[PDB]
Design an enzyme around this catalytic site. Structure first.
Site, PDB file in Angstrom:
ATOM      1  N   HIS A   1       0.782  -1.233   0.000  1.00  0.00           N
ATOM      2  CA  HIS A   1       0.000   0.000   0.000  1.00  0.00           C
ATOM      3  C   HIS A   1       0.814   1.284   0.000  1.00  0.00           C
ATOM      4  O   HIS A   1       1.376   1.653   1.047  1.00  0.00           O
ATOM      5  CB  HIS A   1      -0.895   0.017   1.213  1.00  0.00           C
TER       6      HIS A   1
ATOM      7  N   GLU B   1     -16.561  -4.473  25.847  1.00  0.00           N
ATOM      8  CA  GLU B   1     -15.676  -5.648  25.843  1.00  0.00           C
ATOM      9  C   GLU B   1     -14.578  -5.647  24.763  1.00  0.00           C
ATOM     10  O   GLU B   1     -13.441  -6.018  25.051  1.00  0.00           O
ATOM     11  CB  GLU B   1     -16.421  -6.929  25.652  1.00  0.00           C
TER      12      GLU B   1
HETATM   13  C1  TPP Z   1     -23.048  -7.303  25.146  1.00  0.00           C
HETATM   14  C2  TPP Z   1     -23.499  -7.446  26.527  1.00  0.00           C
HETATM   15  N1  TPP Z   1     -22.576  -7.294  27.514  1.00  0.00           N
HETATM   16  C3  TPP Z   1     -22.933  -7.409  28.814  1.00  0.00           C
HETATM   17  C4  TPP Z   1     -24.221  -7.669  29.149  1.00  0.00           C
HETATM   18  C5  TPP Z   1     -24.647  -7.708  30.598  1.00  0.00           C
HETATM   19  N2  TPP Z   1     -25.548  -6.495  30.852  1.00  0.00           N
HETATM   20  C6  TPP Z   1     -26.889  -6.538  30.847  1.00  0.00           C
HETATM   21  S1  TPP Z   1     -27.599  -5.074  31.259  1.00  0.00           S
HETATM   22  C7  TPP Z   1     -26.013  -4.386  31.450  1.00  0.00           C
HETATM   23  C8  TPP Z   1     -25.774  -3.011  32.015  1.00  0.00           C
HETATM   24  C9  TPP Z   1     -26.922  -2.114  32.300  1.00  0.00           C
HETATM   25  O1  TPP Z   1     -27.218  -1.446  31.053  1.00  0.00           O
HETATM   26  P1  TPP Z   1     -28.306  -0.299  31.020  1.00  0.00           P
HETATM   27  O2  TPP Z   1     -28.734  -0.328  29.598  1.00  0.00           O
HETATM   28  O3  TPP Z   1     -27.688   0.932  31.548  1.00  0.00           O
HETATM   29  O4  TPP Z   1     -29.444  -0.772  32.059  1.00  0.00           O
HETATM   30  P2  TPP Z   1     -30.762  -0.210  32.711  1.00  0.00           P
HETATM   31  O5  TPP Z   1     -30.440   1.189  32.981  1.00  0.00           O
HETATM   32  O6  TPP Z   1     -31.716  -0.400  31.596  1.00  0.00           O
HETATM   33  O7  TPP Z   1     -31.034  -1.018  33.913  1.00  0.00           O
HETATM   34  C10 TPP Z   1     -25.044  -5.308  31.200  1.00  0.00           C
HETATM   35  C11 TPP Z   1     -23.570  -5.113  31.414  1.00  0.00           C
HETATM   36  C12 TPP Z   1     -25.151  -7.825  28.059  1.00  0.00           C
HETATM   37  N3  TPP Z   1     -26.433  -8.071  28.249  1.00  0.00           N
HETATM   38  N4  TPP Z   1     -24.741  -7.763  26.759  1.00  0.00           N
END
Ligand code: TPP
Ligand code: TPP
Ligand code: CA
Ligand code: CA
Lengths: 678, 678
Positions: free
Chosen positions: A28, A416
């Site tokens: 490239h 992640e």
């Molecule tokens: C890709 C992924 N990583 C991690 C999780 C675990 N997980 C589920 S809810 C969440 C965090 C809370 O998110 P948010 O949208 O702020 O939640 P709420 O305010 O709706 O309770 C995580 C880390 C997931 N579901 N999918």
């Protein structure tokens, strides 16, 4: 201030990069030609020793758009690193020191790049490790750590989601020594960026908390480029993105077109380029002496002096601060504390049933203070991963009130893939940094582009992956791993530990932390598992071992993680109808495979039926077992004992499949799956 | 204009959601409580028929924050979908219709979500599929397509890099009917979002080209929420993000705490909450008659009427427009054209050696014309993937001039993970859309998150995965797949095709396009491959077949892709030494495993050693072969034929390991690897 020699050096860089690509007839040329002015200006002011590519306080450069590699190899040659003109003539050829994309293994190449979005996210990790080293060891009169992290990047890196996650965390952490230069040349492979990439980049980066500077003429404005970089050094509290406009393939007859992106220039094009820049069109790989003399004077002798002053300072520091100086000296040599493993927890059959996630928590709480190089984190799952030691201070900007840069616990947020490339960056920084990161095992798959580079490069990062199976229960098939461990056991150079009990979890941590070149995924359970009779750290450190033996067994049961205690209950049910079963615990395929064949064949011998037991995919088990009881469909949402039952994973369910395996092979002569023929 | 029945509706949703979670003693109560106001206002204004969840012009709703499931299950029940109180009373229990995260199989659930960032990216594809159907089929007097796509999302979704890729592309394409409502509640699992997520979301979405609107009190301001949705429907050329501030777990004693995110409320908290809302605290799963009556008049009977009108306008349409009427009618019935496969290219031994990636390109040229529902694209690899047909129009906004919304080639940019979820959303929209996306096989791993949900839900999307192996050559190990196929062959319900020649490419496209519930990856070569004597569409469609037979084989060589031709050559070499080799071609493990066991045993019988040949990981071959020749280490940068020679993949190199295999087993009785004991 820049002079005629600086312009001769920019032209020599451009034509060296072009001659490298053209001899290989692969590669490239375009971004090498547009970014040569910036490369000259940046490297000329970097503090670095070409002679000692490992100096801990060197300024670090990352080429995130790794396809532009002919530029990085031209700079490394011209500034004094161990890369000769003959190596550049072997670009993209089999077995050379010059592969088609930069690899971590070459001196002066900081990380492997080429998969887009990785290099900028690694550079965010390098800048975090610098901020932590400084806050831990710097003392009044002893600034041991103060380097900059510099990144080149292109349109493709900014379209990748991973570099959004890393830049949002970097803005939050206020990493002011991180300076990113974006090659804004309006071209990607399909043509002009306008076709799918017209977002306001400068505005998105200010939303993340970054400072954005502009260089309208990147093709020739050396003083503006220099201006822009030292203004970025003044903003200590913000990472900086310099958006610099250049013409892709500057100087080419087809300058500005996507055709110069990723194919060699035409010979006639290479000849007018050379003529235009004041070079003989009939000569190749030409370096003017004035150019070698110039980089000797401006980079290499200043850098060797800078490194020598730094060494005097550090040996005074070790006199002044005996404990801290011995610690950093031990870290800079790649060595863990002597007898550090004496502090790992060991258990017996009478101790209670504990989920291996809680057992992992206990290991991090018992060794955190033994190992200052251990820096942890969770991708917003700290309470479910149990990755946090309670004396811990969080890694945060000092102005936040939540912690400071001396902290060793990182809040990665729900990111992640950047967490994986950032841990690669922290590892690649040096000083024995041992990064680990937590998430659910099912979503380590979100980080696969980065985990693959941990294995390819050899960065020994640790993934603490909890909620390893259908034992999750009620969250159901979207959260229950099936294929994940078969995926990473097919990836070369990664440990995939699925520990069965407390002694196996300490074995997994011992080997993971002692590794210098191999990343590790430690898969951990939600549910409680008993402490096994017959397990030890010594045994489990071998990757696979005989847990429960019997003379002349009818079958060998090979299991991992939560299915080892089940196979041990199964062998009790079998003993009662007079079938003798040996139970083998296999906590890591990698480590087991590295043992001498004599040891491995004593674990999995000839002339016995071997059946594997594991509540995940059976596709990887043909290398160790004749028959396999596992799960090759998605899970189910319900309470974990009920889900185990539904899939048949009970002591009697396992004993029945073993009775069937013995019957199927009865009277046949069996060969150990381990024996290869070639 | 909301009244006291809208407040009673919002209380019944909150409480029915809290009861659903509290009876399972598992689940997430926080965001269903915070977003119930906005779900009432939105669903009341959506045009949908609950007794026909498949009506093509229905407005679509996606719950991207999938863990808030109890809110969706609540709404489906209350507005008259096929979900009863009894189903809700079985939430998160084995076998129930209400799993812990929403699945595509349930009516009213548009896609499966739960893994964060997926739902918002699927909703982008649903918007693209709508803009293409409207542009292809609407005629003056006949507006057949005009629906909106509504998305609920939370903080986690905004941190994941996939929603940045998808949101960048969505702004570029000016998708004015995509309206997303952000639950801005300041809390994620690790606590407050200020701990790792303090970016300016509004300013980032305005840089992508989106409109941002704000609702400061989402806990109670119903008019304000309705005013934001109404103004967003005026956004014709801009997607709209509505930033709606709410309090997590509104009404609970611990509202605004992350302790209310993912655990049931304590029993007495649920009581006081019921009393606070005017409900008896000792009763549960109570729906006031007034709430059912009200949704029947506001949503259900107007939706049935709207569907019934739409039905009469489609009858008028088919008479005014018989040609397009017939086509849309066939697509809504979900059937491919009568005998379309007749246009698929077939070849013979006499034809040229062609790269399998370029054979892929010829199939897409022969079919885009036959299949109006085929919509393709590339993640900025259009020239390397040969995925663009010559007469193609790009899917672009009309204002762009570069193409328009009736165009069928999507320029996704370097966005693999979003391309996977967007393809899932285009397929889930209906009307028989057949999406495909191109990229290099090694970077389909950037998209693992979405590929797993294509398999889990059964979206038949197609990945045209070029550059399948070390045959990449000069780009080196960062671009050479090793583990990639072992990973997706370990994933349930996905076809992984690795075609050897012209006829096998056609069989890979006919099984992949006829597929209704199974995604597909087609791995394609960069280098030229011969047309094989003995290959045919009919035989390769069986997934594995005998390419070259001999009677009384000394050995079976099983191979795939580029190694089948190598295996034919090695068989000529073995023939010279009086060794007779049967060559089996196995273009897909999934399709081959679907054949009847007696067909599979005819292909891979007992009593013969079986050796597999494939230049990728050997770990998944033990289900078919005794011994395996492959690569279990990373690649190398060099010209492709030199790299194949470097790893031993030469005609005589395969022949030598075939002879060692014959030698090792001579005298032993061999069982087919297909046979299992249970
Ligand atoms: C890709 C992924 N990583 C991690 C999780 C675990 N997980 C589920 S809810 C969440 C965090 C809370 O998110 P948010 O949208 O702020 O939640 P709420 O305010 O709706 O309770 C995580 C880390 C997931 N579901 N999918
Ligand atoms: C993750 C990933 N996807 C795809 C590719 C293939 N690829 C290499 S460069 C490129 C795009 C070129 O982008 P840019 O950074 O704009 O190029 P430049 O202006 O530097 O020439 C692509 C798609 C890649 N290396 N990695
Ligand atoms: Ca570019
Ligand atoms: Ca939230």
């Amino acid at each position: 201030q820049f002079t005629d020699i600086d312009k001769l050096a920019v032209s020599t860089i451009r034509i060296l990069a072009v001659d490298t690509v053209s001899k290989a007839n692969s590669g490239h040329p375009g971004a090498p030609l547009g970014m040569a002015p910036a490369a000259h200006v940046l490297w000329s002011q970097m503090r670095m020793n070409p002679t000692n590519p490992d100096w801990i306080n060197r300024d670090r450069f990352v080429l995130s758009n790794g396809h532009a590699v002919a530029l990085l190899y031209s700079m490394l040659h011209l500034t004094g690193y161990d890369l000769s003109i003959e190596d550049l003539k072997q670009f993209r050829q089999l077995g050379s020191r010059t592969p088609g994309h930069p690899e971590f293994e070459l001196p002066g190449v900081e990380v492997t790049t080429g998969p887009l979005g990785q290099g900028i996210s690694n550079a965010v990790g390098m800048a975090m490790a610098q901020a932590n080293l400084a806050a831990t060891y710097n003392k009044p009169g002893f600034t041991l750590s103060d380097n900059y992290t510099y990144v080149f990047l292109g349109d493709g890196c900014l379209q990748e989601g991973i570099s959004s996650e890393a830049s949002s965390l970097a803005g939050h952490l206020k990493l002011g020594n991180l300076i990113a230069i974006y090659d804004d040349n309006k071209i990607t492979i399909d043509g002009a960026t306008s076709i799918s990439f017209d977002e306001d980049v400068a505005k998105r980066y200010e939303a993340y908390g970054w400072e954005v500077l502009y260089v309208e003429n990147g093709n020739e404005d050396l003083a503006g480029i220099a201006k822009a970089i030292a203004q970025a050094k003044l903003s200590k509290d913000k990472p900086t993105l310099i958006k610099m406009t250049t013409t892709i393939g500057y100087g080419s007859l087809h300058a500005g077109s996507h055709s110069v992106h990723g194919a060699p220039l035409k010979a006639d094009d290479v000849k007018q380029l050379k003529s235009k820049f004041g070079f003989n069109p009939d000569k190749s790989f030409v370096v003017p002496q004035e150019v070698y003399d110039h980089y000797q004077k401006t980079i290499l002798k200043p850098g060797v002096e800078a490194n020598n002053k730094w060494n005097k300072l550090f040996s005074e520091y070790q006199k002044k601060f005996p404990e801290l100086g011995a610690e950093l000296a031990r870290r800079l040599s790649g060595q863990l504390p002597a007898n550090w493993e004496s502090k790992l927890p060991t258990y017996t059959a009478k101790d209670s049933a504990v989920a291996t996630r809680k057992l992992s928590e206990t290991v991090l709480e018992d060794v955190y203070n033994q190992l200052p190089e251990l820096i942890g984190g969770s991708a917003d799952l700290t309470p479910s991963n149990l990755t946090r030691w309670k004396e811990a201070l969080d890694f945060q900007p000092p102005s936040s009130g939540s912690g400071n840069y001396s902290g060793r616990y990182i809040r990665y947020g729900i990111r992640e893939h950047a967490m994986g490339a950032i841990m690669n960056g922290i590892s690649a920084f040096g000083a024995n940094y041992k990064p680990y990161g937590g998430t659910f095992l099912n979503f380590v798959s979100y980080a696969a582009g980065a985990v693959r580079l941990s294995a390819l490069s050899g960065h020994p990062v640790i993934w603490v992956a909890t909620h390893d199976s259908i034992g999750v229960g009620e969250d159901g098939p979207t959260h229950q791993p099936i294929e994940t461990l078969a995926h990473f056991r097919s990836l070369p150079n990664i440990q995939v530990w699925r520990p069965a009990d407390g002694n196996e979890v300490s074995a997994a941590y011992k080997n993971s932390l002692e590794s210098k070149h191999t990343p590790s995924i430690i898969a951990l359970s939600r549910q409680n598992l008993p402490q096994l009779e017959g397990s030890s750290i010594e045994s489990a450190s071998k990757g696979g071992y005989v847990l429960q033996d019997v003379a002349n067994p009818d079958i060998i049961l090979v299991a991992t993680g939560s299915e080892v205690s089940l196979s041990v209950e199964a062998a009790k049910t079998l003993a009662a109808k007079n079938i003798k079963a040996r139970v083998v615990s296999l906590p890591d395929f990698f480590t087991f495979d590295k043992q001498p064949l004599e040891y491995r064949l004593s674990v999995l011998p000839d002339n016995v039926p071997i059946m594997s037991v594991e509540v995940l995919a059976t596709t990887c088990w043909g290398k160790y077992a004749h028959q396999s009881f596992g799960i090759d469909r998605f899970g189910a949402s319900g309470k974990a004992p009920e889900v185990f039952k539904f899939f048949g994973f009970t002591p009697e369910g396992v004993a029945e499949r073993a009775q069937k395996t013995i019957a199927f092979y009865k009277g046949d002569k069996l060969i150990s799956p381990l024996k290869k023929a070639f």
